Every structure is written in C-alpha cells, then in structure tokens.
Design a protein around this ligand. Structure first.
Ligand SMILES: *CCC(=O)N1CCN2c3ncnc4cc(-c5c(C)ccc6n[nH]cc56)c(Cl)c(c34)OC[C@@H]2C1
Ligand SMILES: Nc1nc2c(ncn2[C@@H]2O[C@H](COP(=O)(O)OP(=O)(O)O)[C@@H](O)[C@H]2O)c(=O)[nH]1
Ligand SMILES: [Ca+2]
Ligand SMILES: [Mg+2]
Length: 168
C-alpha cells in the first residue's frame, strides 16, 4: 500500500533529538524529556503528494558500542545528524556520528541531513558558514531548526525523506 521510511535521529546528549521528533509527530515542545528513553515514533504524512509512513528512531541510552545498536542503525534508511548551535562540542561530535554510521552501513553515501537545532537561542557559538561548509564537504543538505518555535522541523525530516527517495 503506502511507503514507510525508517528515519534515525542521532546527536549528543541535550541537542533536542526527542524535542524535534516529538514536535514532528505530536505538534508540541518538550521541556525536560527523560534522556534514557530510546523509542520509535510513527506519523502518516503527505510529502510531494505521496502519503507515507515515518518510523523515527530517537536515539538515547549510553555512550557505548553494542552489536544490538549496530542492528537498529543498519535498519535506518536515513539519519538526521543533530547538533545545537550553542554547543560547539555537539558540532565537534557530528564527525564521529558520521564515522560510526559509515562503519555499520560500510557505505560512503548514506542519506543524511545535518541539523543545527536551537536556532531561537541568542547565544550562538557555532557559525552557519562552518555548519554549511561541513554539510557541503559531506555532500548532504543543512537545515537550521528550533523544536521550540517549530521552524525547520518539517523541512528537516521531509528533506531526509527526499534524500532517501533519491537513493535506491
Ligand atoms: C543524553 C543521552 C543521549 O541522548 N545520547 C547519549 C548516548 N548516545 C551516543 N553517544 C555516543 N556514541 C553513540 C554512538 C552511536 C552509534 C552509532 C552512531 C552507530 C553504531 C553504533 N553502535 N553502538 C553505538 C552506535 C549512537 Cl546511535 C549513539 C551514541 O546514540 C546517541 C546517543 C546520545
Ligand atoms: N530553546 C530551545 N530549547 C530546546 C530546543 N530543542 C530542545 N531544547 C531543550 O533542550 C533540552 C534538551 O532537549 P532534548 O530534546 O531532551 O535533547 P536530546 O538529548 O537530544 O533528546 C531540553 O530541556 C529542551 O527543552 C530548541 O530548539 N530550542
Ligand atoms: Ca550498557
Ligand atoms: Mg532524548
């Protein structure tokens, strides 16, 4: 019947992964979401006139390697790489998330999107141009998002879907 996409949302602790995913699915902003909850969220959506199913895995757990986490990641068709623009270490870590995904996919061209989250915060420490240059060198799109104001949430997930469709 209707297509399903496995989206995986990766990024450092407290970048807004669950806030983004919950805003897309449930249309509200979470203030203090339980940071151990790793669950899968679904939504029916119309993208370029195609009704589709989003299965969104919102990563949590521990900073540790597991055979079981390789398996969940290998099921993923595309990945949002999320940093907050007020945390330069969250952006320093994007490199390791891309490396870890290349290892399990044993692929250079995995549908990915770079997300600079918390675009509403005054206190920016990571500059758009640097984020842009990183996405241009990975060959992936870049979207600035605020889970609070909902700016760029839709277009971040939809751009990932459109990256997975271009992939075959
Ligand atoms: C506050 C908790 C939270 O949101 N976290 C902390 C734990 N991680 C995390 N931290 C470090 N390394 C990680 C590595 C992977 C991973 C990847 C990308 C591919 C294959 C893997 N095999 N074992 C682990 C991994 C992931 Cl998915 C995470 C992670 O998930 C994010 C999460 C963020
Ligand atoms: N101001 C602002 N706060 C955010 C945004 N996204 C998440 N937060 C807050 O940042 C903290 C971490 O968010 P969370 O979604 O739990 O991070 P996760 O560890 O990636 O799941 C929370 O207290 C959120 O309310 C955002 O876009 N703007
Ligand atoms: Ca453990
Ligand atoms: Mg979380």
């Amino acid at each position: 019947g209707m297509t399903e996409y496995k989206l995986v949302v990766v990024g450092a602790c407290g970048v807004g992964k669950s806030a983004l995913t919950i805003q897309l699915i449930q249309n509200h902003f979470v203030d203090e979401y339980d940071p151990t909850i790793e669950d899968s969220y679904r939504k029916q959506v119309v993208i370029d006139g195609e009704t589709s199913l989003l299965d969104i895995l919102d990563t949590a757990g521990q900073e540790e390697y597991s055979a079981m986490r390789d398996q969940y990641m290998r099921t993923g068709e595309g990945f949002l790489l999320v940093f907050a623009i007020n945390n330069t270490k969250s952006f320093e870590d994007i490199h390791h998330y891309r490396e870890q995904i290349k290892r399990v996919k044993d692929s250079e061209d995995v549908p990915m999107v770079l997300v600079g989250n918390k675009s509403d915060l005054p206190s920016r420490t990571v500059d758009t141009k640097q984020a842009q240059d990183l996405a241009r060198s990975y060959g992936i799109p870049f979207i600035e998002t605020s889970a609070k104001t909902r700016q760029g949430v839709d277009d971040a997930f939809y751009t990932l879907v459109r990256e997975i469709r271009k992939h075959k």
